[PDB]
Design a binder for this molecule. Structure first.
Ligand SMILES: Nc1ncnc2c1ncn2[C@@H]1O[C@H](COP(=O)(O)OP(=O)(O)OP(=O)(O)O)[C@@H](O)[C@H]1O
Ligand SMILES: Cn1c(=O)c(F)c(Nc2ccc(I)cc2F)c2c(=O)n(C[C@@H](O)CO)cnc21
Ligand SMILES: [Mg+2]
Length: 291
């Protein structure tokens, strides 16, 4: 069935970012619980019809690594996108509580992210454009899923003005110009894994002293660090060398030299992690407190 504003009822607010707020809602006619994301745009009706039009391709997104989609519409000045409610929230929220995320678990996260990007490229000819821990959602069934990928050109265009004035997961090439594509997602995945693995945004790297204890920056300063100074890496010894190599292959500054999805799919770390027996669902609930 078609979704519309009056058929919904707010339960609670799940969080907000730059340019969007997300509610946990009840869709009254079905009784289903959903996550309704609102993007406040005031923009000419002509193009906001185009946006809703372009967003309908998410009905063709069926994948165990992509958040389910229920529908998209326009309301009182707001674009609504209604997704599956992921009761374990995002990986940035999970890292927040967990402090630091185990390597074995990150292994399963990498598999989900890799297969996720693969589906999007294969079945839809699109890159993600915003891979970061807040955009990898998990739930009590143990499923790890991507959302907030860029399906609509007009939306991408209509949002270009804002962005994050700190912490960038953008690749060096994206920061420097318009010449980027799927490879740029590999960089963001790499950076996200390092963050989750260590427990804080990895730029700048920790001191020798900050490291042993473990185990603000200005905009141009941070960006200049991403572009010119050597990429971040996993501290030696306390992560397997397969995992270190894995992130190293993701964090190569040159997009063509950098590993791609097909190569990462067969990396020793993924191959090791595919075999591993991990109660992800159990680890999730036991850390963030669910059932
Ligand atoms: N489908 C969902 N199920 C459960 N929680 C969600 C869902 N989608 C988003 N959220 C939560 O809502 C919050 C806000 O999401 P939103 O995508 O607006 O911004 P963000 O991903 O936090 O950061 P940014 O705005 O910079 O992209 C996220 O932190 C996430 O925890
Ligand atoms: C271009 N684009 C999009 O095209 C887009 F679809 C987006 N959303 C989206 C995509 C897939 C699924 I499943 C659920 C979503 F909410 C999207 C998006 O969410 N964001 C994030 C901001 O709203 C921050 O709050 C940015 N661009 C999006
Ligand atoms: Mg987001």
């Amino acid at each position: 069935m078609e979704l519309k504003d009056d058929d919904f009822e707010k339960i609670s607010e799940l969080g907000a970012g730059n340019g969007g707020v997300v509610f946990k809602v009840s869709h009254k006619p079905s009784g289903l619980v959903m996550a309704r994301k609102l993007i406040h745009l005031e923009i000419k009706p002509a193009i906001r019809n185009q946006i809703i039009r372009e967003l309908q391709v998410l009905h063709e997104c069926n994948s165990p690594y992509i958040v389910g989609f229920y529908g998209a519409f326009y309301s009182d000045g707001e674009i609504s996108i209604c997704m599956e409610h992921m009761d374990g929230g995002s990986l940035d929220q999970v890292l927040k509580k967990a402090g630091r995320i185990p390597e074995q678990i990150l292994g399963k996260v990498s598999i989900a992210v890799i297969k996720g990007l693969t589906y999007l490229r294969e079945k839809h000819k699109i890159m993600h454009r915003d891979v970061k821990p807040s955009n990898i959602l998990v739930n009590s069934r143990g499923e790890i899923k991507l959302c907030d990928f860029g399906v609509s050109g007009q939306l991408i265009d209509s949002m270009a003005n804002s962005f994050v004035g700190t912490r960038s997961y953008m690749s060096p090439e994206r920061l420097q110009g318009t010449h980027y594509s799927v490879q740029s997602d590999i960089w963001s995945m790499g950076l996200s894994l390092v963050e989750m693995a260590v427990g804080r945004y990895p730029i700048p790297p920790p001191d020798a002293k900050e490291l042993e204890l473990m185990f603000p920056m200005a905009i141009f300063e941070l960006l200049d660090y991403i572009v010119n100074e050597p990429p971040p890496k996993l501290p030696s010894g306390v992560f397997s060398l397969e995992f270190q190599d894995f992130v190293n292959k993701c964090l190569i500054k040159n997009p063509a030299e950098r590993a791609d999805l097909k190569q990462l799919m067969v990396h020793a770390f993924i191959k090791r992690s595919d075999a591993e027996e991990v109660d992800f669902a159990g680890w999730l609930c036991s850390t963030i407190g669910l059932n």
